[PDB]
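Exercise 4. Each item below gives a protein and its sequence. For each, produce the structure-token representation.

Item: UPF0339 protein SO_3888 (Shewanella oneidensis).
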Amino acid sequence: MSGWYELSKSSNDQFKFVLKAGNGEVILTSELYTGKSGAMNGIESVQTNSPIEARYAKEVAKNDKPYFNLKAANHQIIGTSQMYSSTAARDNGIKSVMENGKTTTIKDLTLEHHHHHH
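Answer:
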């Protein structure tokens, strides 16, 4: 488990959490949740989905851009990855995601004024 979760607030007060591989490099970026309950519960969902590969969604853009999304049991979009360069980068990323996506290290940047990035 080399990575961790960071939840941050957007200009609309909407919350989005980012999963980092280990060195700080972000592998998963979730979209704007209108409520923290959905974001955090989304993280716990990812923890249960992490060992269950049947929950993934692997896609490649027409410009040969490999990426992947993560769905919960109700088929909702809880996680979304950033366009990688090589196909190998994507699948190696997934291996990291499975390892760290099941971590309990969660940082709240919404309540405290730690505005890292918009």
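Check: The longest helix spans residues 36-49.
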